Amino acid sequence: SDQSVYAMVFTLLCSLGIVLCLVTSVTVEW
């Protein structure tokens, strides 16, 4: 490439990735 929409979707995908990193890291050690 509105850039605000791109920043919004990027923040949402990054936050979901952080949560999924937490779930993977907990489940393997469990």
Long-range contacts of 12-16 (CB under 8 A, 24+ apart): none
- Tell me the DSSP string of 1-30: --HHHHHHHHHHHHHHHHHHHHHHHHHHH-
Q: Which amino acid is at 28?
A: V
- Using alpha carbons, list the distances in angstroms from residue 11 to 6, 7, 14: 9, 6, 5
Can you give the resolution of this entry in Å? Answer: 3.0
Comparing CA positions, the residue from 2, 20, 8 lying closest to residue 28 is 20
Give the pair of three-digit tokens for residue 10. 């990027």
Instruction: Give the closest residue to 10 by CA, choosing from 1, 25, 23.
Output: 1
Chain centroid to CA 3: 19
Q: What approach was used to elucidate this structure?
A: cryo-EM
